[PDB]
Scaffold this active site. Structure first.
Site: not given
Ligand SMILES: [Zn+2]
Lengths: 338, 76
Positions: A14, A163, A166, A214, A217, A295
């Site tokens: 089913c 981020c 930054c 990041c 960064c 079911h």
């Molecule tokens: Zn950053």
């Protein structure tokens, strides 16, 4: 009355029948089968999975040339899908969304308009505005995956990763063929489908052990990640995540999620300054049971005539639209409104 | 590289992976964080359920892609 044939239960199948009925009532997919348009799209050569498309289409053709009270056997189709996806060999209980994903993958691959996939190398698209980058990523996807199945089900997500130090927002665009939605836990007066969509598309805080790196960064930073819908599909399949995150024993989440029959308006989830879509419901796959067993049934609206029926293997019965929204709903099938 | 997993209740987690990471590797990394066994996990990306034995590179999964974690409602 047309398209009201039941499907024989072959032994815990089913989950399969529920999906097949939802697809049977996916108007444009049905039409693709009935008008035999797949024949032009099938790949030349001795292919192992040609018969998957043929038997799927034959089944839909049979359903839509039936009389009410007819019961059709999908045994030949089952043979083909289990050859494509061996996990469906035998007669164990299975997940309907898992089945849907494997079936549509198989169908798509066999009618893909791209017969030789280009490799493609990653590109620096930082010079492009967000929307243009999205369009280019979409083009790159379509040059590999381009089928009638895709025409119906495929959309594009934007994931925006900012981020917090930054401020750089890194964007990526992921195709999707369905959306799997977390279920809200803090809803009042009830949990709605929109609440679940909001949990999917919310700002996700990535900090502590989840800090991304990041590249700007040059270190791990707290970031905010957010989904939006860049491109909406013609058919939107919504999959409710009805399973707990227990590290010991998963339990089924049986929470009622209120979903609309008409006018599902997804404006708030569209990417910024991007045209949004509105949908009407046409099918539901229901699960009754636990995570380990149960079911499946389907509720489907017949295309054009607008009448709802319950499909429970061999049994196909009329139902009122007031009976469609239940806590058992697991997969929702939406089509573009008007 | 980093990829993301949208988990069961609203959260996203961050994984460190290489393109050569197998799907088994990825599931193990998810288990490390979430305590969900690999044999329970299903990972969806671009409509594909990712299969053991294959790598992220096989699926052309690039940095900052999101995998969608789902379990099962088994039914007959
Ligand atoms: Zn950053």
């Amino acid at each position: 009355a047309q398209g009201l044939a039941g499907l024989r239960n072959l032994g815990n199948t089913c989950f399969m029948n529920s999906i097949l009925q939802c697809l049977s009532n996916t108007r444009e997919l049905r039409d693709y089968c009935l008008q035999r348009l797949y024949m032009r799209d099938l790949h030349h050569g001795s292919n192992a999975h040609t018969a998957l498309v043929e038997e799927f289409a034959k089944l839909i053709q049979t359903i839509w040339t039936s009389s009410p009270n007819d019961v059709v056997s999908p045994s030949e189709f089952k043979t083909q899908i289990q050859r494509y996806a061996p996990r469906f060999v035998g007669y164990n209980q299975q997940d309907a969304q898992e089945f849907l994903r494997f079936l549509l993958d198989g169908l798509h691959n066999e009618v893909n308009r791209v017969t030789l996939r280009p490799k493609s190398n990653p590109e620096n698209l930082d010079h492009l505005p967000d929307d243009e980058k999205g369009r280019q990523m979409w083009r790159k996807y379509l040059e590999r995956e381009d089928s009638r199945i895709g025409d119906l089900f495929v959309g594009q997500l934007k994931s925006s990763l900012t981020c917090t130090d930054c401020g750089y927002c890194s964007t990526v665009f992921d195709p999707f063929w369905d959306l799997s939605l977390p279920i809200a836990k803090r809803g009042y007066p009830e949990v709605t489908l929109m609440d679940c969509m909001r949990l999917f598309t919310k700002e996700d805080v990535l900090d502590g052990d989840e800090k991304p790196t990041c590249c700007r960064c040059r270190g791990r930073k707290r970031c905010i990640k957010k989904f939006s819908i860049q491109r909406f599909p013609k058919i939107l399949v919504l999959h409710l995540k009805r399973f707990s995150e227990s590290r010991i024993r998963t339990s089924k989440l049986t929470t009622f999620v209120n979903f609309p029959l008409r006018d599902l308006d997804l404006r708030e989830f569209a990417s910024e300054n991007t045209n949004h879509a509105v949908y009407n419901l046409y099918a539901v796959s229901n699960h009754s049971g636990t995570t380990m067993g149960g079911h499946y049934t389907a509720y489907c609206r017949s295309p054009g005539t607008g009448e709802w029926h319950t499909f429970n293997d061999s049994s196909v019965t009329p139902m009122s639209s007031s009976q469609v929204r239940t806590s058992d709903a697991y997969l929702l099938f939406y089509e573009l409104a008007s | 590289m980093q990829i993301f997993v949208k988990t069961l209740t609203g959260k996203t987690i961050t994984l460190e992976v290489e393109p050569s990471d197998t799907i088994e590797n990825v599931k193990a990394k998810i288990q490390d964080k979430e305590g969900i066994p690999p044999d329970q996990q299903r990972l969806i990306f671009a409509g594909k359920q990712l299969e053991d034995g294959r790598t992220l590179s096989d699926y052309n999964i690039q940095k900052e892609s999101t995998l969608h974690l789902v379990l099962r409602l088994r039914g007959g």
